[PDB]
Design a protein around this ligand. Structure first.
Ligand SMILES: [Fe+3]
Ligand SMILES: [O-]
Length: 217
Protein backbone atom coordinates (compact mmCIF):
# COMPACT_ATOMS: atom_id res chain seq x y z
CA UNK A 1 0.00 0.00 0.00
CA UNK A 2 1.53 3.26 -1.22
CA UNK A 3 2.38 5.90 1.38
CA UNK A 4 -0.33 8.56 1.71
CA UNK A 5 0.15 11.71 3.78
CA UNK A 6 -2.42 14.41 4.42
CA UNK A 7 -2.78 17.92 5.82
CA UNK A 8 -5.54 18.49 8.45
CA UNK A 9 -7.62 16.35 4.15
CA UNK A 10 -7.91 19.12 1.60
CA UNK A 11 -4.29 18.27 0.60
CA UNK A 12 -2.93 14.74 0.21
CA UNK A 13 0.26 13.25 -1.28
CA UNK A 14 0.47 9.67 -2.46
CA UNK A 15 3.77 7.99 -3.29
CA UNK A 16 4.13 6.36 -6.78
CA UNK A 17 7.84 5.57 -6.30
CA UNK A 18 10.98 6.69 -4.41
CA UNK A 19 10.96 10.12 -6.04
CA UNK A 20 7.50 10.64 -7.50
CA UNK A 21 4.35 11.51 -5.61
CA UNK A 22 0.88 12.58 -6.69
CA UNK A 23 -0.49 15.70 -4.96
CA UNK A 24 -4.26 16.04 -4.72
CA UNK A 25 -6.20 19.08 -3.37
CA UNK A 26 -9.91 19.73 -2.72
CA UNK A 27 -11.36 22.99 -3.99
CA UNK A 28 -14.67 24.01 -2.42
CA UNK A 29 -13.72 19.04 -6.23
CA UNK A 30 -10.35 17.24 -6.20
CA UNK A 31 -7.42 17.97 -8.52
CA UNK A 32 -4.11 16.15 -9.09
CA UNK A 33 -0.52 17.05 -9.93
CA UNK A 34 2.93 15.58 -9.26
CA UNK A 35 5.70 16.21 -6.75
CA UNK A 36 9.13 15.26 -8.02
CA UNK A 37 11.73 14.84 -5.31
CA UNK A 38 15.03 15.59 -6.97
CA UNK A 39 18.59 15.98 -5.83
CA UNK A 40 18.36 19.71 -6.58
CA UNK A 41 14.97 20.55 -5.21
CA UNK A 42 11.29 19.74 -5.55
CA UNK A 43 9.57 20.16 -8.89
CA UNK A 44 5.80 20.20 -9.17
CA UNK A 45 3.62 19.35 -12.10
CA UNK A 46 0.75 21.85 -11.58
CA UNK A 47 -0.12 24.19 -8.77
CA UNK A 48 -3.60 24.23 -7.20
CA UNK A 49 -6.98 25.96 -7.29
CA UNK A 50 -5.81 29.06 -5.53
CA UNK A 51 -2.97 30.70 -3.66
CA UNK A 52 -4.00 29.49 -0.23
CA UNK A 53 -3.86 25.84 -1.27
CA UNK A 54 -0.68 26.37 -3.32
CA UNK A 55 1.11 27.92 -0.31
CA UNK A 56 0.00 25.04 1.88
CA UNK A 57 1.07 22.41 -0.65
CA UNK A 58 4.50 23.99 -1.04
CA UNK A 59 4.94 24.28 2.75
CA UNK A 60 3.94 20.66 3.27
CA UNK A 61 6.36 19.23 0.73
CA UNK A 62 9.29 21.50 1.65
CA UNK A 63 8.98 20.40 5.28
CA UNK A 64 8.62 16.75 4.46
CA UNK A 65 11.34 16.44 1.85
CA UNK A 66 13.67 19.03 3.41
CA UNK A 67 14.34 20.91 0.20
CA UNK A 68 12.82 23.84 -1.64
CA UNK A 69 10.28 23.84 -4.44
CA UNK A 70 12.26 25.31 -7.35
CA UNK A 71 10.06 24.80 -10.44
CA UNK A 72 6.47 24.12 -11.43
CA UNK A 73 5.15 22.98 -14.82
CA UNK A 74 1.71 24.49 -15.61
CA UNK A 75 -0.23 22.20 -17.93
CA UNK A 76 -2.98 24.64 -19.04
CA UNK A 77 -4.38 28.08 -18.11
CA UNK A 78 -7.34 26.93 -15.83
CA UNK A 79 -7.55 27.62 -12.08
CA UNK A 80 -6.91 24.03 -11.00
CA UNK A 81 -3.54 24.18 -12.78
CA UNK A 82 -2.51 27.83 -12.48
CA UNK A 83 -4.50 29.34 -9.57
CA UNK A 84 -1.38 29.55 -7.43
CA UNK A 85 0.75 31.48 -9.92
CA UNK A 86 0.95 34.62 -7.76
CA UNK A 87 2.47 32.53 -4.97
CA UNK A 88 4.96 30.92 -7.33
CA UNK A 89 6.13 34.21 -8.74
CA UNK A 90 6.52 36.01 -5.42
CA UNK A 91 8.49 33.08 -3.96
CA UNK A 92 10.86 32.90 -6.89
CA UNK A 93 9.57 29.51 -8.04
CA UNK A 94 10.00 29.13 -11.79
CA UNK A 95 6.62 28.58 -13.50
CA UNK A 96 7.13 26.82 -16.83
CA UNK A 97 4.47 26.78 -19.54
CA UNK A 98 4.02 26.94 -23.25
CA UNK A 99 3.75 30.38 -24.84
CA UNK A 100 0.07 29.72 -25.57
CA UNK A 101 -0.65 28.89 -21.94
CA UNK A 102 1.12 32.12 -20.91
CA UNK A 103 -0.91 34.10 -23.64
CA UNK A 104 -4.16 32.67 -22.23
CA UNK A 105 -3.21 33.23 -18.58
CA UNK A 106 -2.58 36.92 -19.47
CA UNK A 107 -5.75 37.22 -21.41
CA UNK A 108 -7.65 35.94 -18.38
CA UNK A 109 -6.00 38.17 -15.79
CA UNK A 110 -3.48 35.82 -14.19
CA UNK A 111 0.16 36.53 -13.76
CA UNK A 112 2.17 34.97 -16.51
CA UNK A 113 4.24 31.81 -16.45
CA UNK A 114 7.45 31.68 -18.51
CA UNK A 115 6.17 30.56 -21.89
CA UNK A 116 9.39 28.54 -22.29
CA UNK A 117 8.01 25.14 -23.30
CA UNK A 118 7.88 24.18 -26.95
CA UNK A 119 5.93 21.32 -28.56
CA UNK A 120 8.49 18.93 -27.11
CA UNK A 121 10.77 20.12 -24.29
CA UNK A 122 13.20 18.04 -22.32
CA UNK A 123 14.16 19.23 -18.84
CA UNK A 124 16.40 17.72 -16.19
CA UNK A 125 16.31 18.50 -12.47
CA UNK A 126 19.12 16.78 -10.63
CA UNK A 127 18.79 13.24 -11.88
CA UNK A 128 15.06 13.61 -12.74
CA UNK A 129 14.26 13.74 -16.46
CA UNK A 130 11.01 15.42 -17.52
CA UNK A 131 9.58 15.74 -21.02
CA UNK A 132 6.68 18.08 -21.81
CA UNK A 133 4.56 17.44 -24.91
CA UNK A 134 1.84 19.48 -26.56
CA UNK A 135 -0.29 16.89 -28.39
CA UNK A 136 -2.87 19.30 -29.79
CA UNK A 137 -6.13 20.77 -28.64
CA UNK A 138 -8.48 18.81 -26.40
CA UNK A 139 -9.77 19.72 -23.00
CA UNK A 140 -8.39 23.17 -23.77
CA UNK A 141 -6.53 24.69 -26.66
CA UNK A 142 -3.28 24.67 -24.74
CA UNK A 143 -3.23 21.46 -22.70
CA UNK A 144 0.13 19.66 -22.39
CA UNK A 145 1.11 16.31 -20.96
CA UNK A 146 4.22 15.54 -18.96
CA UNK A 147 6.27 12.36 -19.31
CA UNK A 148 8.85 10.90 -16.93
CA UNK A 149 10.93 8.65 -19.15
CA UNK A 150 12.79 6.99 -16.23
CA UNK A 151 9.50 5.63 -14.95
CA UNK A 152 7.22 5.66 -18.05
CA UNK A 153 4.77 7.74 -16.04
CA UNK A 154 2.45 10.07 -17.98
CA UNK A 155 0.78 13.06 -16.38
CA UNK A 156 -2.28 13.36 -18.56
CA UNK A 157 -3.75 16.37 -16.85
CA UNK A 158 -7.21 17.44 -17.82
CA UNK A 159 -6.83 15.96 -21.30
CA UNK A 160 -7.26 12.54 -19.65
CA UNK A 161 -10.39 11.52 -17.80
CA UNK A 162 -10.38 9.12 -14.86
CA UNK A 163 -12.42 5.87 -14.88
CA UNK A 164 -14.94 7.53 -12.54
CA UNK A 165 -15.60 10.36 -15.02
CA UNK A 166 -18.68 9.46 -17.00
CA UNK A 167 -18.73 12.50 -19.23
CA UNK A 168 -16.33 15.14 -20.58
CA UNK A 169 -17.02 17.74 -17.89
CA UNK A 170 -16.48 21.40 -18.73
CA UNK A 171 -16.27 21.65 -22.52
CA UNK A 172 -16.60 25.42 -22.62
CA UNK A 173 -12.97 25.73 -23.64
CA UNK A 174 -12.68 22.30 -25.32
CA UNK A 175 -12.14 21.14 -28.89
CA UNK A 176 -14.24 18.11 -29.17
CA UNK A 177 -13.43 17.36 -32.79
CA UNK A 178 -9.57 17.41 -32.16
CA UNK A 179 -9.39 15.89 -28.61
CA UNK A 180 -9.39 12.33 -29.98
CA UNK A 181 -6.52 13.13 -32.40
CA UNK A 182 -4.58 14.70 -29.53
CA UNK A 183 -5.07 11.54 -27.39
CA UNK A 184 -3.91 9.46 -30.35
CA UNK A 185 -0.81 11.65 -30.60
CA UNK A 186 -0.03 10.81 -26.94
CA UNK A 187 -0.59 7.10 -27.56
CA UNK A 188 1.71 7.26 -30.61
CA UNK A 189 4.50 9.05 -28.76
CA UNK A 190 4.37 6.92 -25.62
CA UNK A 191 3.77 3.31 -26.68
CA UNK A 192 4.79 1.74 -23.33
CA UNK A 193 3.14 3.46 -20.30
CA UNK A 194 3.34 2.36 -16.62
CA UNK A 195 0.92 4.83 -14.92
CA UNK A 196 -1.27 7.64 -16.17
CA UNK A 197 -2.19 10.45 -13.79
CA UNK A 198 -5.48 12.16 -14.81
CA UNK A 199 -6.21 15.79 -13.98
CA UNK A 200 -8.93 14.65 -11.55
CA UNK A 201 -9.53 11.18 -10.04
CA UNK A 202 -7.63 7.97 -9.49
CA UNK A 203 -4.30 7.07 -11.11
CA UNK A 204 -4.67 4.49 -13.89
CA UNK A 205 -2.86 3.29 -16.94
CA UNK A 206 -3.21 3.58 -20.75
CA UNK A 207 -6.78 2.49 -20.25
CA UNK A 208 -7.59 6.06 -19.15
CA UNK A 209 -6.59 7.27 -22.62
CA UNK A 210 -8.93 4.67 -24.19
CA UNK A 211 -11.65 5.72 -21.74
CA UNK A 212 -11.29 9.32 -22.82
CA UNK A 213 -11.55 8.26 -26.49
CA UNK A 214 -14.80 6.47 -25.63
CA UNK A 215 -16.22 9.55 -23.86
CA UNK A 216 -15.52 11.56 -27.02
CA UNK A 217 -17.84 9.32 -29.13
FE1 LIG B 1 -9.10 22.53 -17.12
O1 LIG C 1 -9.33 22.10 -15.50
Amino acid sequence: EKTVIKNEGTISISQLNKNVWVHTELGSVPSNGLVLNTSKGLVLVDSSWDDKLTKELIEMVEKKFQKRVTDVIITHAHADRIGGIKTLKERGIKAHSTALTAELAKKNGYEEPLGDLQTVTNLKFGNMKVETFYPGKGHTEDNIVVWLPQYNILVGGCLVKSTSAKDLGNVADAYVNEWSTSIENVLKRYRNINAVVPGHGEVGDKGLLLHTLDLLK
